[PDB]
């Protein structure tokens, strides 16, 4: 039914598309760290992987999401860059 109100949630990282441009495949985790910063979650088991979620939500305005998945090589090398909005 109707929604009177609730407080607003917020999430880490706030990727600026411009920041999304500064990165290219084949980077070490350190350079990635220099721009992207500390991913709140690494896949615990798949391999080296970095997860960057900008997940803003103003109150009772639904959830708005984007998802940046980075898969690294065992020798500390970025192999896959996946970008999602919404879905």
């Amino acid at each position: 039914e109707r929604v009177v109100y609730r407080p607003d949630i917020n999430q880490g990282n706030y990727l600026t598309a411009n920041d999304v441009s500064k990165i290219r495949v084949g980077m070490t985790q350190q350079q990635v760290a220099y721009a992207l910063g500390t991913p709140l979650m690494s896949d615990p088991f798949g391999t080296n992987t970095w997860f960057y979620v900008f997940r803003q939500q103003p109150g009772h305005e639904g959830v708005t999401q984007q998802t940046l998945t980075l898969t690294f090589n065992s020798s500390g090398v970025l192999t896959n860059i996946d970008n999602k909005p919404a879905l």
């Binding site: 009177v4 109100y5 609730r6 407080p7 949630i9 917020n10 999430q11 880490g12 990282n13 706030y14 910063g37 500390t38 709140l40």
Partner: protein
Amino acid sequence: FVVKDIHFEGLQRVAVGAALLSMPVRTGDTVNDEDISNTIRALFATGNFEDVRVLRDGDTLLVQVKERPTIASITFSGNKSVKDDMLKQNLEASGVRVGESLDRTTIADIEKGLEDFYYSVGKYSASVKAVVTPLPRNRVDLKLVFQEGVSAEIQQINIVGNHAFTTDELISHFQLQKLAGDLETLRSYYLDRGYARFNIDSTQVSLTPDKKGIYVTVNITEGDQYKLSGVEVSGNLAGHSAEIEQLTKIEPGELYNGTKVTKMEDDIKKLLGRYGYAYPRVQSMPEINDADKTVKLRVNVDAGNRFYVRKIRFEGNDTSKDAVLRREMRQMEGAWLGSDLVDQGKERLNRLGFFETVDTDTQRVPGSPDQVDVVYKVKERNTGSFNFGIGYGTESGVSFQAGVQQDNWLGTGYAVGINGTKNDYQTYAELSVTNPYFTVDGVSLGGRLFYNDFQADDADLSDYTNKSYGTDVTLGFPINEYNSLRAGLGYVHNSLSNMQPQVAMWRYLYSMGEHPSTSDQDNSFKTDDFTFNYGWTYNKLDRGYFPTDGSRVNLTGKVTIPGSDNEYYKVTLDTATYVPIDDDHKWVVLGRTRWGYGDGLGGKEMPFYENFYAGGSSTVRGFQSNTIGPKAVYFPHQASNYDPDYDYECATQDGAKDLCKSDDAVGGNAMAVASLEFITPTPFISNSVRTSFFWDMGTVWDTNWDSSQYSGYPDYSDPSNIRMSAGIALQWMSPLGPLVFSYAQPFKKYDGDKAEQFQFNI
């Protein structure tokens, strides 16, 4: 020389191994004469011996040792001006204290030290003597011979260089103490008023003839008047410069204010932290102009890094649930540090009032540039109260009573206020089970089940039956951070019988469609009421227990829905607002204001049970409970079939001829009271107690009262009769609960009103 074994003598307090450890040399080691000196000095370093002697029995080294200690008692005799408890505290910060190693070589050093501590209070000619007296073991007691000088401060304070300010008004600020602090309040006074190149050039202190009092003369250069030329912002502003310009706004010709500068620095920091920049770099470089006497404030800024919050920890929540504290977060775990959100968590937490203290500490996470963690240091203050007032009857059956609200049920939040009063005739009870968070967003579901079985039993018939019972389910809707609403339903059944005859009452019965006798008791009426309970509450107080600033406004209304035997509307308004005058928040001004109005709807009147009443600690102090307002005017009554001689006769035919006026308040359908309390610090532990100096007032009246018809009697519809009072209120927080005491004397006293100077409740 090869050591074969080691032996010690005279060890007493110090253990064998503990000495063996502090030693540099031990068994087997090749020892020559230097090593002996080294280890002897090493034993001396442990500071437990007066003497160390080391010598070998051919090959087996022997350690003769003579101990120094032990202090057991430090006694004072001849001290009246300085307390012992504090003397103790002073010795502890000097090394020499109760239960420590005493050093004989520093004896005079202690004596001297004592003589120096007495210079602050005002004694400059006191001589002290030390007593070293041994005890059964190696222990010693410390008796101290005190010979305090004469009491002189003495007089007086002098200032040279003051042109802008008069010496009198200047001195009046220190007293409203020791030298550095008033030198600082002076320096501060001048600096606040815009004297930057103000300096304390000399502090001359002369000795009085009896040489125990001093004459102070301080010399200073007052700088001219200095106004800020402008604020230049420089450095890395991370693209948020625009807001910074508005923070660095200066008034035209605004005087140089160091504390305004610091205030600004912190404003900037705060602003930055809101975006995430938790650790910023702010610096002020005030270049001085002396010809035009202006100051340019150059400020270098470097934002640094911004994203930080990893985990949130709550420390000090022993009874309370982690959930209860974490729900009040505005800052999310895994989010931007938003200092606003963090300190808002501090705020929500402080408004709850479950804690004496709520403190924020944001700590960096090691190895990680981005992360930090915010921890909330809380100190629980306990909730609610167990109390009652027992005794005393014996003429009547049994004087029993209870009462307990917990405001937080054993660490759950489900606040309940269960209260009850059983008597040999009267019986009352109420429930208020309410959870402030029914939904994740703060929907307050309450249910207050109040019920009272009022037998009122004297004649067991035709004597005022007053049964009543009702339920108040309620729901709170938080619309914003500081505001909420309410909607709920209240039911109430009331069986009234043998209503004693009185004007207002009957007036109400008559407009209802009931027409009882004006002399007969045993007149019955039953009523079933269905109400709609609405509300709205605003709160922006700082604290929940001892609020120092802010305002709380609670508005509650009730209105009969169709199907109810009764028809009325009622609105109640509570306002309290806390205003601080000092930066320490120790002197407050409280503005209380309680309101109530109600009337019938469909050509009806409002029930006398929903009446408003004033008088008492909860409404107006200095008065009997609910005595303020309308009084009863009973009709010429007969009997309840009970007529014993000389007892409880109000308007009884046994000596009654005409309508009778009484003290028995009936209360009115309209009301207004207010208070103005002056909160001051109680002398003087320095927030375990709070006292105020109040000015209370209030008036209760019945609007449907016909002044035309009953002209020969006072007008119970005239509001201008405001009974007033004033006095003292002591709010002490005892472990059994929050206790209040008020001694108030009502100067504006109207007839029919009862007095109660000393009041004690809860």
